[PDB]
Write a protein that binds this ligand. Structure first.
Ligand SMILES: CCN1/C(=C/C2C(=O)C(/C=C3/N(CC)c4ccccc4C3(C)C)C2=O)C(C)(C)c2ccccc21
Ligand code: NI
Ligand code: NI
Ligand code: NI
Ligand code: NI
Lengths: 98, 101
């Protein structure tokens, strides 16, 4: 579901800017590497995908290039915390056995 | 945000049905327990969520005896496929991140 791809993409992006400030191609590469070629990145598509995040306010663009914002780190710390809880809830359902 | 909560709610409900066919009261009980009390779902929320999932052929429903006659919900063939996919692709994302160290 295209809905759920873009979800998965954004998280890869953000986890890259997390590790350091990076630019289009330097991101693609790092993903290519880390995916083990597995992640066919797309030069045409990272436009729209990076506007909506600066537009939302989680990402900044300075000239040499992108950085993770005050907000940004929060909205992940949130998401990673809440989804981790969900993992534990799912373990306990497997443990409830029902 | 609202979008994410309802998403997280969709996952927990589907994982509930994965561990076995189940009815509304049973699900909410089993979710209260699993969430140590943090998570208490109302019938009405559930019904609207299940309404879309039946309508997209993800789950379906049937009557079963015992109590009295209850409405049971089950993961459909397609349901099972989507969770496998979801779980697989998400497990990939997880390792990729790791290889950003
Ligand atoms: C992180 C943001 N995110 C989401 C994240 C996650 C996520 O993480 C996740 C499922 C996981 N699973 C599947 C059980 C596992 C399993 C083991 C370790 C970690 C995970 C994670 C990655 C948390 C999932 O779905 C989803 C649901 C796609 C989502 C929808 C809409 C907007 C954002 C968003
Ligand atoms: Ni930053
Ligand atoms: Ni930083
Ligand atoms: Ni089945
Ligand atoms: Ni089944």
């Amino acid at each position: 579901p295209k809905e759920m791809l873009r979800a998965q993409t954004n998280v890869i992006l953000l986890n890259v800017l997390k590790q350091g400030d990076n630019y289009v191609y330097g991101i693609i590469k790092q993903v290519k590497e880390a995916s083990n070629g597995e992640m066919e990145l797309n030069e045409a598509t990272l436009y729209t995908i990076f506007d909506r995040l600066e537009q939302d306010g989680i990402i900044s663009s300075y000239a040499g290039y992108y950085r993770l914002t005050e907000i940004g780190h929060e909205n992940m710390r949130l998401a990673f915390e809440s989804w981790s809880r969900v993992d534990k809830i799912i373990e306990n359902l497997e443990a409830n056995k029902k």
